[PDB]
């Protein structure tokens, strides 16, 4: 299997992006396999 | 090797994630390559650095992203889709709570190829990398950032 890489862009900030989403606060635990789960 | 935002391909082919070349070194999430090699042109990358807990791996030498979330301030993913062109989607964080402290977390919700996207702060600096989170049904992405 062949796994290779493209260019797609500059790292840069754009003023003129689309604005969107939430801003949950969670509490989250994280496992030895590197998986979030949520904790109550 | 020139710095920027790279999409990572397999072999027809797909894109089964991306990833940032900063200083010489290419940035990507583990679940995005499990390490293999990459092809660059006619170059070879070689993993470096990983981390299966963080979900990160570094090529060519050690992990370089430093910067970090203020807390306060808007971000914007430098999202790269499949077939879709680099694009700025700018969003207020919200915080994934642990144990261990506090991480931003992004509610955005693009096509599983699009993980390792970088997340930037207003300077253009790489905050974190997309595609390691949770289910709430929205997706929710950490901010996740390495050690330099």
């Not at chain 2, 990833?19 to 293999?36: D, I, L, P, R």
């Not at chain 2, 964080?93 to 261990?100: A, E, N, S, V």
Request: hydrophobic share 35%; charged share 25%; glycine share 14%.
């Amino acid at each position: 299997v062949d796994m290779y890489i493209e260019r797609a862009g500059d790292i840069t900030w754009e003023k003129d992006a689309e604005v969107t989403g939430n801003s949950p606060r969670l509490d989250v635990a994280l496992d030895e396999s590197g998986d979030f789960s949520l904790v109550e | 090797t020139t710095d920027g935002v790279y999409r990572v391909m397999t072999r027809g082919s797909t894109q089964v994630g991306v990833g940032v070349m900063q200083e010489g070194v290419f940035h990507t999430m583990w679940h995005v390559t499990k390490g293999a090699a990459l092809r660059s042109g006619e170059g070879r990358l070689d993993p470096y650095w990983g981390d299966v807990k963080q979900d990160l791996v570094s090529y060519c030498g050690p992990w370089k992203l430093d910067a970090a979330w203020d807390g306060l301030s808007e971000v914007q993913l430098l999202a790269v889709p499949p077939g879709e062109r680099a694009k700025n989607i700018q969003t207020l964080p919200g915080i994934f709570k642990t144990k261990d402290g506090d991480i931003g977390a992004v509610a955005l919700d693009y096509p599983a190829g699009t993980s390792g996207s970088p997340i930037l702060d207003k300077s253009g600096r790489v905050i974190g990398l997309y595609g390691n989170g949770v289910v709430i049904g929205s997706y929710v992405s950490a901010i996740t950032q390495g050690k330099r």
